[PDB]
């Protein structure tokens, strides 16, 4: 409800002054999901004005390293170029250049439910030798 | 050469074969029978001009399949991005 | 066109060692297979020939005496003015 | 040159009497005839003229009772289009007596040194 409009994390994302109210709301939605539903150790919002994007940079488990989450409404669209740009931004934010560039895309449906997708530079099959039926 | 080679590629593709037509093989290319019984882990790939916006609604993934975005760049190089359902 | 797009990608994927299947629908997804699980299977060595082109047999005799073509099947492929394509398998025979 | 004696052979003269081809064609057809009967142990080998195609082929039973195969002797320097191969396949099926196998013939390629290499050509996808 409207209480979101005055939540401090919501207001902090808007002080980034990047994007409009929906981009702020979508990013706030995902922030709450990571911290409340999925129980991430820490989530910070970062603005990158050149790409006009609000990122969530988080640690899922206190020991491990940072990962970049990029909220977006289902209505939005992305070029592959834009995806490449986000990959390169994520490489900076995660500080892991020894690993393939990657980030998590947090797609918010209109009814506010969040589906997550991992995007990685290059060729990622979890089991390239797998053989199964059908 | 080209329009003539691709008329054969598409026919072999339609018959279910795997193809490799790398430049290594000279003018030859390799043709492998399809396997209707066995699923071999693979990418489901898409060709995208680098600037064309992909609609996020137009988005099936597991250990044996990964979505693969492909785009050639001005410099003749193509970039690839794998896309996978995240289990958060 | 957007049809040069698919060629550049297909060629790069080939050069990297992948195999392509179900890649004839220019407008659709295609499949990209890692080479290693597949390459050791039986397969054709295939060749594109305009139907009127003469196929020089000198190479097929080099193959014959050096024992290079024994357990192999060569696939001659030619499209016709039909629109169709015709296929002839070519195998070394001991006799 | 060293082989003028083969012009006396009755199967050479039979092939030549088809009045198909030049001396290289008749000669390599005869050489393949000798190879099939002596370097293999073929039962019978008959020659047949296809003047439409201007080809001599050998039709034989590799083993008595077994079905007939078509052998198409060819110099190393002949010109073979895929289209020509398809026409030989179609003619070969008639000579074999329209069985049930897919169209095939054997191409017998003869090098200037009289070495012969045999290739089976079959309609479609074999392995």
CB C15 within 8 A of CB B23: yes
Read off the CATH number of the domain in which C29 is found: 3.40.1350.10
Domain extent listing, chain D: 8-127
Count of domains in chain B?
A: 1
Which residues constitute the domain of residue C62? 2-91
Residue C44: list chain B partners with CB under 8 A. Answer: 30-32
Helix (H) / strand (E) containing B5: helix B2-14
Going by C-alpha positions, the residue among D26, D40, D121, D120 that lies closest to residue D74 is D26
Task: Using alpha carbons, list the distances in angstroms from residue A105 to A59, A63, B87, C52, C62.
Answer: 16, 22, 12, 54, 57
Neighbours of chain D (3+ CB pairs under 8 A): C
This entry's atomic model was obtained through X-ray
Helix (H, G, I), strand (E, B) or coil at B38: strand
Helix (H, G, I), strand (E, B) or coil at A81: helix
Q: For residue B21, tell me if it sits in a domain.
A: yes
**Among partner residues B10, B22, B70, which is closest to C15 by beta-carbon distance?**
B22
Query: For residues B9 and C21, what is the distance between their CA atoms, to the nearest angstrom?
Result: 10
Chain D touches chain A, with at least 3 Cβ pairs below 8 Å, answer no
**Among partner residues B28, B46, B78, which is closest to C29 by beta-carbon distance?**
B46
Query: For residues C34 and D92, what is the distance between their CA atoms, to the nearest angstrom?
Result: 41
**Do residue C21 and residue B20 have CB atoms under 8 angstroms apart?**
no
Q: For residue D14, is it left (φ>0), alpha (ψ between -120 and 50) or beta?
A: alpha
**Nearest residue in C to B49, CA atom:** C5
Residue C37: list chain A partners with CB under 8 A. Answer: 128-129, 131
For an interface test with C, the pick among A80, A126, A128 (most C C-beta atoms closer than 10 Å) comes out as A128
Dmax over CA atoms of chain B, in Å, equals 49
Q: Report how many Cβ contacts below 8 Å link chain A to chain B.
A: 113
- Closest chain C C-alpha to B88 CA, distance in angstroms: 27
Strand partners, A47: A54
**Among partner residues A77, A78, A129, which is closest to B41 by beta-carbon distance?**
A129
Query: For residues C71 and C58, what is the distance between their CA atoms, to the nearest angstrom?
Result: 19
Query: For residues C13 and C7, what is the distance between their CA atoms, to the nearest angstrom?
Result: 10
Number of helices (H) and strands (E) in chain C: give both, helices first. 3, 5
For an interface test with A, the pick among B37, B43, B54, B56 (most A C-beta atoms closer than 10 Å) comes out as B56
Helix (H) / strand (E) containing C23: none
**D10-17 helix and D23-34 helix, angle to the nearest 10 degrees:** 140
Q: For residue B88, tell me if it sits in a domain.
A: no
**Do residue C86 and residue D86 have CB atoms under 8 angstroms apart?**
yes
Task: Using alpha carbons, list the distances in angstroms from residue A19 to A54, A88, A134.
Answer: 8, 20, 45
């Amino acid at each position: 409800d409207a209480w979101m409009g005055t939540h401090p994390k919501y207001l902090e994302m808007m002080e980034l002054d990047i994007g409009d109210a929906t981009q702020v709301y979508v990013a706030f939605l995902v922030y709450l999901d990571l911290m409340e539903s999925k129980s991430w150790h820490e989530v910070n919002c970062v603005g990158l004005p050149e790409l006009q994007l609000i990122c969530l940079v988080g640690t899922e488990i206190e020991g491990e390293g940072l990962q970049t989450v990029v909220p977006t409404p289902i209505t939005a669209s992305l070029s592959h170029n834009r995806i490449r740009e986000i990959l390169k931004a994520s490489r900076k934010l995660q500080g892991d250049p020894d690993l393939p560039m990657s980030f998590t895309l947090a797609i918010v449906e209109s009814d506010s439910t969040i589906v997550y997708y991992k995007l990685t530079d290059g060729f990622m099959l979890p089991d390239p030798q797998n053989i199964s039926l059908r | 050469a080209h329009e003539l080679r691709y008329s054969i590629y598409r026919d072999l593709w339609e018959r279910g074969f795997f193809l490799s037509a790398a430049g290594k093989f000279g003018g030859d290319f390799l043709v492998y029978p399809g396997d209707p019984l066995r699923f071999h882990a693979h990418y489901i790939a898409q060709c995208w001009a680098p600037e064309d916006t992909i609609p996020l609604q137009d988005l099936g993934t597991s250990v044996r399949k990964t979505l693969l975005l492909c785009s050639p760049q001005p410099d003749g190089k193509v970039v690839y991005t794998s896309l996978q359902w995240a289990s958060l």
